[PDB]
Ligand binder design. Structure first.
Ligand SMILES: CCCCCCCCCCCCCCCCCC(=O)OC[C@H](CO[C@@H]1O[C@H](CO[C@H]2O[C@H](CO)[C@H](O)[C@H](O)[C@H]2O)[C@H](O)[C@H](O)[C@H]1O)OC(=O)CCCCCCCCCCCCCCCCC
Ligand SMILES: CCCCCCCCCCCCCCCCCC(=O)OC[C@H](CO[C@@H]1O[C@H](CO[C@H]2O[C@H](CO)[C@H](O)[C@H](O)[C@H]2O)[C@H](O)[C@H](O)[C@H]1O)OC(=O)CCCCCCCCCCCCCCCCC
Ligand code: CLA
Ligand code: CLA
Ligand code: CLA
Ligand code: CLA
Ligand code: CLA
Ligand SMILES: CCCCCCCCCCCCCCCCCC(=O)OC[C@H](CO[C@@H]1O[C@H](CO)[C@H](O)[C@H](O)[C@H]1O)OC(=O)CCCCCCCCCCCCCCCCC
Ligand SMILES: CC1=C(/C=C/C(C)=C/C=C/C(C)=C/C=C/C=C(C)/C=C/C=C(C)/C=C/C2=C(C)CCCC2(C)C)C(C)(C)CCC1
Ligand SMILES: CC1=C(/C=C/C(C)=C/C=CC(/C)=C/C=C/C=C(C)/C=C/C=C(C)/C=C/C2=C(C)CCCC2(C)C)C(C)(C)CCC1
Ligand SMILES: CC1=C(/C=C/C(C)=C/C=CC(/C)=C/C=C/C=C(C)/C=C/C=C(C)/C=C/C2=C(C)CCCC2(C)C)C(C)(C)CCC1
Ligand SMILES: [Cl-]
Ligand SMILES: [Cl-]
Ligand SMILES: [Fe+2]
Ligand code: NA
Lengths: 336, 35, 31, 348, 36, 449, 76, 37, 44
């Protein structure tokens, strides 16, 4: 009947006429994401130096402390806190909240909730638009990777100080320390993931080139070929069967996608399932399952070890390992 | 400092309750389709 | 026989089965 | 051609027999592509199976010494061999095939045959697109794998001391090449590599998001729970609602496509431009022209014993890689470094 | 001319393939490159 | 069976063809339960064939024998195995039971009735009969409540359960007076999952474990009776979806939750997963290395209360952020670890210096050394140690394997829940096949998006 | 037209291949069983990666007499 | 090791774990045999 | 002590409630949202 206050608020929230859809997953996604955005921007601008390692030496991380855009990074929570929940209200003051790594753990918790509700909001808008609902499933792969690097790896290793720092050189630091400790390069799940981005780029170039190579002539040479398409037209704007013929006599006549829906399913599923596999690889290496270990596999008849490519990889790994936490180790085994 | 915790608890509880009762308010009937 | 299809299939198939045999043989070569 | 007599010649006869539709299209590029590509792939399959890397690198690098799929590789020649083309008849092998495998000649074989096979493959795309009368945007999109292959496997070792520093064709050998670029070139910090990474990640995003959008905006044409059989490729109607897709992504993301031609050209443009900028960066590294250091930050850390960043952490990690990797990775230098001068952290 | 089933042919070929990769994964633990 | 033409479902979605075929659906389920029981029995027999008694069970790649030994079968004081026969009995019983279940599944899948409502109306159901579906749900809650009370009976009267907190280093114990306090039981449930709290992973005594099982068994039986005797209320009807795919998606979300929590139990918990059987936990190994080197550097004539590290924060002992004395080094991140060989050495201020000096025990120090050498770090070739180590130790912890695989399964099952929640919603809505192409909802809305 | 559905279902295909495929497989078997791979491609056997003259991995360290340097660093 | 009565049955114990993987592969075999209808 | 903290880390408090005012405001906010949701019913 549409008179009540909850009715007005509810139809406003589920309204598909808003410039940006809000929805019920949006009533969580919007405040969590603005919280994470505000804290991330303020921390990237002027966060005081954060003690990542727990050993009374901080990493600066903020632009106002002499960092450029490549170096600047929201530094993770302290190693002393571990997986303990560390809100602002739990800290004695904002200043030591900052020094122990509070902004990071805040931004990561809000980013988790924001991407989860972004996925829910994607499903919701597809439901309200009569769509099919699996764009949320396709988006679950970058969400899986984000959870794997920001929360699942800290749970497996025992501290948010092992999470990815929110920055560029901090990300590179995470990758190098991670390979040093777990050998991600020789992990089959990371191999599938690398194949996923390489394939996503390959089939993106392939799909774009085959569609652009078959666009039907509608405009003149002095106009953009894009002007041959008008938004909302029902005609097919390219020659799908001709692109099939070209692809077939280029690679395999019979092993070519003769269905456009098959082609788009492969386009959707290949990088998504591979990012699922690499996100799960990061999760497996959170619980220390690690990559392939072929260090001193090959030996001669005398039993003397022959170095191999995996052994050169291992020497690089020892180089990476003896530099991460240059002063935080008291014991030889890296069980932390 | 406790005040900030009380206010944030109010914020999170309010938004979570809004989410919960928004989905409880006959969401599977807000499809555009027939039935 | 001897078609383009036969040549294209065989140029890969014959060394594939040859090297598979070699790898199976030296797969049981012990130290 | 063109209302002219054009007496049939041996060229036109061979062109007729070559440019025909069959099981595998040969054309004129097949006079190049099929032998070069077959010899490159077969040479890699032979080298990963039987050819050792014992005399070039002091490593076991084939399935015959006990190595698996990931550690076998066709390894680069010795650095003393420099940038020699390693002919089987040349001054080094001097006609002996067996000593040519041991000298690292199979790497030069595979690299040259693979490069000319890439040329033949692009020319094959060109002739097939011309025969079917389609635009050669597939060739233009293939220009980026060729740029990457040339910059990494020819231009980079040609800039360095020799083919030894080129990537060896294998899995763990490629990982070694990547780790070497991390430790020595700091290749993550280079903005050209950053543009390449952004291109590849955005292209994988474009692949996944385009496939998902098309299959979640499909039109009905149904009477059956499987949607793949609602498509018949000889039709003049779209299968999915570009309008619904545009509305969905406009309200989810803020922006959304409204032109399919622009969308597909963008799907071409992102990975190709990414790989081109990454190739330009590798060409820059061929001369050791590197984006290694930030001088202001490095001076600040030197003058302030309390200022560390993740950048300075990466610099220390890189130095650890170099010093712990050099002795076993560059055996020509005979680096018999004592363990007391190797830089380490604490304990461990 | 269509006597033996294609599915029987493919199942036998898949058995031979899985046998090959199983022998490969068996001999990763013995012989050359087994680290014992 | 059916084909694409008669159902619209391709072969790669063939099980959807039996969504509305109750008898074949029952057959698929019974054959599947036959597979689960079959794997349990077959792998149990494989483990007891490949079991070795002079080694602990975490070194032989065992995942089911630790589970049986936690119930108090074949092990005595110290967790030492005394009889592999109970494990043999469980394996063979499961294998025979799987033969029976497999016959039931094969029969009902192949020659069983297609739909059960025309001949057996008690088992006959359609996905919209909410009364019948809640009856089935109620029957299954009584079944699960009897399972939980079966564990309660095992702990109370049938030999007890293995208690790693028993004095001396762990022993099988008859649980007497399990905690029945609702405050204590549900405080675990409403607890935060972060450090020091850990949600319900931080359950640390079989008293709480068995009391929660009494509680959950009684709730399951009561809710089963309630579901048999009720129907969902109109708010539940207006909020939920009532398709079989929807019920599947609800189950998928719940079992994905269960898989994630099972991963965290296997990784952190040591009272339901004793370290004598599963190997040390992640915190346990690092705290063990710190504790061992502490006692060696007491034996080498040095004061550990003093002697600050290279950062001046303490080589062996330091202060946690909450004020107690903890082990120094990076293992400070695991300062909230609780195990049977640290609690007798822990005072109100955390670790007590005089107790660390004088009240050491030989069993604690060898347990700590063995946990130090057998840390849950290994490769997927089962190469123990960090990624920089040598192929010399063939060991990966069962905690690692279980937490790894069950995080992978919990994540993929969450994704399956996404897929099925979406497909159930769009199927109840009507556009599971696509847009109408003539009554497209997007064309009926205002411009400017 | 032989669309691979007739060839792979042809007993004629399987009678002229039941000898050739196992023949090439056993040829590959004996190729490295009898050391012909070691003879041809020059990969070293497990007892011959090192001699008495050198106890370290080889270094070619030459270009124009690299043929005889490999001839002297290999196993005779 | 199995009890002293069942010691010669250890070989047919050793193959029993892989049987569910054989079951999913058998489902695919049957679908290939019915021509993937 | 040199300062004052809420010192509620650990100890497993129900919903992290260290003073009952937090539980009362959680109860109040969910209660008033349920109240508006209930008074605005018998709709659609
Ligand atoms: C609100 C919910 C927030 C959930 C995410 C926040 C991180 C939770 C966490 O810190 O996780 C860890 C906790 C376990 O907490 C640990 O609990 C432990 C309890 O054990 C203690 O007590 C034990 C008793 O034997 C032992 O003695 C042990 O040694 C001792 O330390 C310790 O207290 C640790 O300090 C503490 O960190 O897991 C748990 O509580 C179980 C929670 C479910 C697991 C969820 C995993 C996947 C999560 C998200 C995936 C998202 C998917 C969708 C998007 C994609
Ligand atoms: C396209 C088409 C479709 C594609 C399908 C692809 C599906 C699968 C493809 C993978 C094939 C698997 C490789 C088979 C070889 C193998 O496995 O070989 C391994 C073993 C057999 O080898 C034995 O492996 C043992 C492993 O050690 C174990 O036992 C040791 C005893 O010393 C130690 O106790 C050690 O701790 C313990 O781990 C020992 O090394 C033995 O010496 C050795 O003989 O097979 C086994 O275990 C059986 C396998 C069980 C593991 C799988 C289920 C558990 C899943 C965990 C997920 C975790 C992580 C995911 C990835 C990351
Ligand atoms: C697609 C065809 C093709 C192409 C483009 C190449 C290209 C290449 N091959 Mg090659 N090769 C091929 C096919 C091909 N190959 C085939 C089919 C085989 C099997 C037999 C081989 C086997 C092979 C080996 C063993 C080797 C190469 C090598 C090489 C590289 C250097 C070769 C060279 O420098 O001499 C170039 C040769 C010519 C330019 C021929 C020119 C002929 C002219 C036009 C005729 C004039 C001659 C006339 C008689 C002169 C007399 C004078 C008189 C008339 C007055 C090079 C990139 C070498 C290598 O890999 O380096 C590592 C190497 O050792 N190839
Ligand atoms: C847990 C695995 C599992 C189970 C229990 C089932 C069960 C079922 N499927 Mg299914 N399927 C599966 C996996 C599974 N499937 C997978 C992975 C795929 C993808 C490849 C399919 C694809 C698929 C399709 C396309 C169809 C089914 C159908 C069916 C149903 C009838 C099959 C039938 O009667 O046709 C005949 C099958 C046979 C004659 C094969 C007989 C072989 C038997 C059953 C194997 C068991 C033998 C065992 C070793 C002996 C034990 C006996 C005793 C000693 C214990 C049935 C309930 C059909 C259906 O929907 O029914 C309407 C159908 O159309 N499935
Ligand atoms: C998920 C539960 C689970 C867990 C935690 C374990 C854990 C363990 N198992 Mg076990 N097992 C399981 C299920 C499980 N298993 C099942 C279902 C079977 C029946 C096939 C077996 C059969 C089995 C045997 C026969 C043996 C073990 C053994 C072991 C131990 C060593 C594992 C190892 O090193 O192998 C290697 C690790 C792997 C092979 C991981 C493979 C990675 C995934 C699964 C495959 C890749 C997926 C791919 C990328 C995606 C493709 C998607 C699509 C196209 C299909 C270890 C403790 C061994 C043991 O120690 O005995 C005491 C042993 O002998 N298992
Ligand atoms: C796993 C078994 C199971 C399942 C599948 C169900 C399923 C269902 N129950 Mg039910 N129930 C169960 C066990 C189960 N119950 C048991 C064991 C009991 C005995 C205590 C009850 C007692 C019960 C009652 C009294 C009622 C239901 C009702 C319902 C229906 C609607 C519930 C709902 O709205 O969803 C989800 C519910 C909510 C989102 C609101 C519940 C409030 C919270 C979530 C309860 C948990 C408290 C806790 C602090 C929350 C955080 C826990 C978390 C941190 C782990 C639904 C079909 C209702 C019904 O329709 O009657 C027929 C109803 O009246 N059940
Ligand atoms: C109890 C759980 C459960 C149940 C009952 C179902 C039931 C159903 N699903 Mg489903 N699904 C689930 C979980 C479940 N699913 C999970 C966890 C996922 C992962 C995201 C999916 C994803 C999925 C998709 C995409 C589809 C279904 C579909 C279906 C329907 C037909 C299934 C079929 O015949 O496919 C045939 C069976 C096969 C093709 C065999 C699958 C082979 C897999 C990929 C190999 C995996 C093995 C490998 C070792 C796993 C390792 C992973 C990692 C842990 C290492 C059916 C009603 C279809 C549907 O919606 O129909 C309406 C369909 O489109 N499901
Ligand atoms: C999707 C995949 C899901 C997979 C796994 C799910 C993970 C975990 C499942 C829940 C485990 C923890 C449940 C208890 C939660 C709790 O008690 O919080 C209580 C905790 C306790 O909060 C802290 O407690 C500390 C002591 O431990 C101190 O008292 C601190 O001052 C206090 O902040 O608060 C939180 O962590 C956040 C609560 C709000 C969470 C908002 C997100 C919810 C989103 C949707 C809910 C919809 C319905
Ligand atoms: C439906 C279907 C299907 C199937 C399924 C299933 C699942 C089945 C099953 C089944 C089963 C699940 C079965 C089982 C069984 C069992 C048996 C058959 C047994 C036994 C016994 C014995 C004989 C033993 C003995 C022994 C002992 C006692 C001890 C010592 C050791 C030994 C071993 C000697 C498929 C998928 C294919 C497809 C679709 C359709
Ligand atoms: C993938 C695929 C395929 C396939 C492949 C293959 C190769 C498969 C297989 C398979 C198989 C390979 C199967 C098998 C099976 C078997 C079974 C399933 C059985 C059984 C039985 C049982 C259950 C047992 C029992 C027992 C016991 C328990 C104890 C003692 C006694 C006895 C032994 C009796 C193809 C290519 C075609 C196509 C495409 C897809
Ligand atoms: C045995 C044991 C124990 C006990 C435990 C227990 C007692 C548990 C429980 C629990 C509980 C008592 C739970 C509950 C729950 C619930 C849930 C988990 C839910 C849900 C759902 C959802 C998610 C929803 C959604 C929605 C909404 C929001 C509304 C309506 C509609 C819809 C659907 C939309 C302890 C730990 C002590 C110790 C150890 C052992
Ligand atoms: Cl570092
Ligand atoms: Cl440490
Ligand atoms: Fe398209
Ligand atoms: Na250090």
């Amino acid at each position: 009947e549409n008179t009540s206050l909850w009715a007005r608020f509810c139809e406003w929230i589920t309204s598909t006429e808003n410039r940006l859809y809000i929805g019920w997953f949006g009533v969580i996604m919007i405040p969590t994401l603005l919280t994470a955005i505000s804290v991330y921007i303020i921390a990237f601008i002027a966060a005081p130096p954060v003690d990542i390692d727990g050993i009374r030496e901080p990493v600066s991380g903020s632009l106002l402390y002499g960092n450029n855009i490549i170096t600047g990074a929201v530094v993770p929570t302290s190693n002393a806190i571990g997986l303990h929940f560390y809100p602002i209200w739990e800290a004695a003051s904002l200043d030591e909240w900052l020094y122990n790594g509070g902004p990071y753990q805040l931004v990561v918790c809000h980013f988790f909730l924001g991407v989860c509700c972004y996925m829910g909001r994607e499903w919701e808008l597809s439901y309200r638009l009569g769509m099919r609902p699996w764009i949320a499933v396709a988006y679950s792969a970058p969400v899986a990777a984000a959870t794997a690097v920001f929360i699942i790896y800290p749970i497996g290793q025992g501290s948010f100080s092992d999470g990815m720092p929110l920055g560029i050189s901090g990300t590179f630091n995470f990758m190098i320390v991670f390979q040093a400790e777990h050998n991600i390069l020789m992990h089959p799940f990371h191999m599938f993931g690398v194949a996923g981005v390489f394939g996503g780029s390959l089939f993106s170039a392939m799909h774009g080139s085959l569609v652009t190579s078959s666009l039907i002539r509608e405009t003149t040479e002095n106009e953009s070929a894009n002007a041959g398409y008008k938004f909302g037209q029902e005609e097919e704007t390219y020659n799908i069967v001709a692109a099939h013929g070209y692809f077939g006599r280029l690679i395999f006549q019979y092993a070519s996608f003769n269905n456009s829906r098959s082609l788009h399913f492969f386009l959707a599923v290949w990088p998504v399932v591979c990012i699922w596999l690499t996100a799960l690889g990061i999760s497996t290496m959170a619980f220390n399952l690690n990559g392939f270990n072929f260090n001193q596999s090959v030996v001669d008849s005398n039993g003397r070890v022959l170095n191999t490519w995996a052994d050169i990889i291992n020497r690089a790994n020892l180089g990476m390992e003896v530099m991460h936490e240059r002063n935080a180790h008291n014991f030889p085994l890296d069980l932390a | 400092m406790l005040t900030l915790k009380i206010f944030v608890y109010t914020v999170v509880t309010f938004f979570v309750g809004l989410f919960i009762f928004g989905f409880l308010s006959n969401d599977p009937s807000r499809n555009p389709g027939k039935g | 026989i001897f078609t383009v299809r036969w040549l294209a299939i065989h140029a890969i198939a014959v060394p594939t089965i040859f090297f598979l045999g070699a790898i199976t043989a030296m797969q049981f070569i012990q130290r | 051609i063109g209302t002219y007599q054009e007496k049939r010649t041996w060229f036109d006869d061979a062109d007729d027999w070559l440019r025909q539709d069959r099981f595998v299209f040969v054309g004129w590029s097949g006079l190049l592509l099929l032998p070069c590509a077959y010899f490159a792939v077969g040479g890699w399959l032979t080298g990963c199976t039987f050819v050792t890397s014992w005399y070039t690198h002091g490593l076991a690098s084939s399935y015959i010494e006990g190595c698996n799929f990931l550690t076998a590789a066709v390894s680069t020649p010795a650095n003393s061999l420099g940038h020699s083309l390693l002919f089987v008849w040349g001054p080094e092998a001097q006609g002996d095939l067996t000593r040519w495998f041991q000298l690292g000649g199979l790497w030069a074989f595979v690299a040259l045959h693979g490069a000319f096979g890439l040329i033949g493959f692009m020319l094959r795309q060109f002739e097939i697109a011309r025969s079917v009368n389609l635009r050669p945007y597939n060739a233009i999109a293939f220009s980026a794998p060729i740029a990457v292959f040339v910059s990494v496997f020819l231009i980079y070792p040609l800039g360095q001391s020799g083919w030894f520093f080129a990537p060896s064709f294998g899995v763990a050998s490629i990982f070694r090449f990547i780790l070497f670029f991390q430790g020595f070139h700091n290749w993550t910090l280079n903005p050209f590599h950053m543009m390449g990474v952004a291109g590849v990640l955005g292209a994988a995003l474009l692949c996944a998001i385009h496939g998902a959008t098309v299959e979640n905006t499909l039109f009905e044409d149904g009477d059956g729970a499987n949607t793949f059989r609602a498509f018949n490729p000889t039709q003049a109607e779209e299968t999915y609602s570009m309008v619904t897709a545009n509305r969905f992504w406009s309200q989810i993301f803020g922006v959304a496509f409204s032109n399919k031609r622009w969308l597909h050209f963008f799907m071409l443009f992102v990975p190709v431009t990414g790989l081109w900028m990454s190739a330009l960066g590798v060409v820059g590294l061929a001369l050791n022209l590197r984006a290694y250091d930030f001088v202001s930050q490095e001076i600040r850390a030197a003058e302030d014993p309390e200022f560390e960043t993740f950048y300075t952490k990466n610099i220390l990690l890189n130095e650890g890689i170099r010093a712990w990797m050099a002795a076993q990775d560059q055996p020509h230098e005979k680096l018999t470094l004592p363990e007391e001068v190797l830089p380490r952290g604490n304990a461990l | 001319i269509g006597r033996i089933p294609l599915w029987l042919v493919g199942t036998v070929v898949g058995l031979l393939a899985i046998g090959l990769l199983a022998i490969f994964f068996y001999g990763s633990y013995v012989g050359l490159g087994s680290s014992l | 069976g059916r084909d694409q033409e008669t159902t619209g479902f391709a072969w790669w979605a063939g099980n959807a063809r039996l969504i509305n075929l109750s008898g074949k659906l029952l057959g698929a389920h019974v054959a599947h339960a036959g597979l689960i029981v079959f794997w349990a029995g077959a792998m149990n027999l494989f483990e007891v064939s490949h079991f070795v008694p002079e080694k602990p069970m975490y070194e032989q790649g065992l995942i089911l024998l630790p589970h049986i030994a936690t119930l108090g079968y074949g092990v005595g004081p110290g967790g030492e195995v005394l009889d592999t026969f109970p494990y043999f009995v469980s394996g063979v019983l499961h294998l025979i039971s799987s033969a029976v279940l497999g016959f039931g599944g094969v029969y009902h899948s192949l020659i069983g009735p297609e739909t059960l409502e025309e001949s057996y109306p008690f088992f006959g159901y359609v996905w919209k009969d909410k009364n019948k579906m809640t009856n089935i749900l109620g029957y299954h809650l009584i079944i699960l409540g009897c399972g939980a009370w079966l564990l309660v009976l095992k702990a109370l009267y049938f030999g007890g359960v293995y208690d790693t907190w028993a004095p001396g280093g762990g022993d099988v114990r008859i649980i007497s007076n399990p905690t029945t306090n609702a405050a204590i039981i549900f405080g675990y449930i409403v607890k935060s999952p972060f450090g020091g709290d850990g949600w319900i992973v931080s359950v640390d005594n079989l008293e709480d474990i068995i009391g929660g099982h009494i509680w959950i068994g009684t709730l399951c039986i009561l809710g089963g009776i309630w579901h048999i005797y009720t129907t969902p209320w109109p708010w539940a009807r207006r909020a939920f979806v009532w398709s079989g795919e929807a019920y599947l998606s609800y189950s998928l979300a719940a079992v994905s939750l269960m898989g994630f929590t099972a991963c965290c139990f296997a990784w952190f918990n040591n009272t339901a997963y004793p370290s004598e059987f599963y190997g040390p936990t992640g915190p346990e190994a690092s705290q063990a290395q710190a504790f061992t080197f502490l006692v060696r550097d007491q034996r080498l004539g040095a004061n550990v209360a003093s002697a600050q590290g290279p950062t001046g924060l303490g080589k062996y002992l330091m202060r946690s952020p909450t004020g107690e004395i903890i082990f120094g080094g990076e293992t400070m991140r695991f300062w909230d670890f609780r195990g049977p060989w640290v609690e007798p050495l822990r005072g109100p201020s955390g670790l007590d210096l005089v107790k660390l000096k004088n009240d050491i025990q030989p069993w604690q120090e060898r347990r700590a050394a063995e946990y130090m050498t057998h840390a849950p770090l290994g490769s997927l070739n089962s190469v123990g140690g960090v990624a920089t180590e040598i192929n010399a130790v063939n060991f990966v912890s069962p905690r690692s394997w279980l937490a790894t695989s069950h995080f992978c399964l919990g994540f993929f099952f969450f994704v399956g829940h996404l897929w099925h929640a979406g497909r159930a919603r769009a199927a109840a809505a009507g556009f599971e096949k696509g847009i109408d192409r003539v009554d497209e909802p997007v064309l009926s809305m205002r411009p400017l998006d | 037209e032989r669309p691979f559905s007739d060839i792979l279902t042809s007993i004629r295909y399987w009678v002229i291949h039941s000898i050739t495929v196992p023949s090439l497989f056993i040829a590959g078997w004996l190729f490295v069983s009898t050391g012909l791979a070691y003879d041809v491609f020059g990969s070293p056997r497990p007892n011959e990666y090192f001699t008495e003259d050198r106890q370290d991995a080889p270094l070619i360290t030459d270009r124009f007499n690299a043929l005889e340097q490999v001839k002297k660093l290999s196993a005779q | 090791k199995l009890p002293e009565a069942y010691a010669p049955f250890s070989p047919i114990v050793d193959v029993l774990p892989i049987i569910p993987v054989l079951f999913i592969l058998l489902a695919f075999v049957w679908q290939a045999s019915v021509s993937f209808r | 002590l040199v300062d004052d903290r809420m010192n509620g880390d650990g100890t497993g408090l129900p919903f992290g409630v260290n003073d009952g005012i937090l539980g009362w405001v959680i109860a109040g906010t969910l209660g008033t949202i349920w109240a508006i949701y209930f008074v605005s019913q018998k709709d659609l």
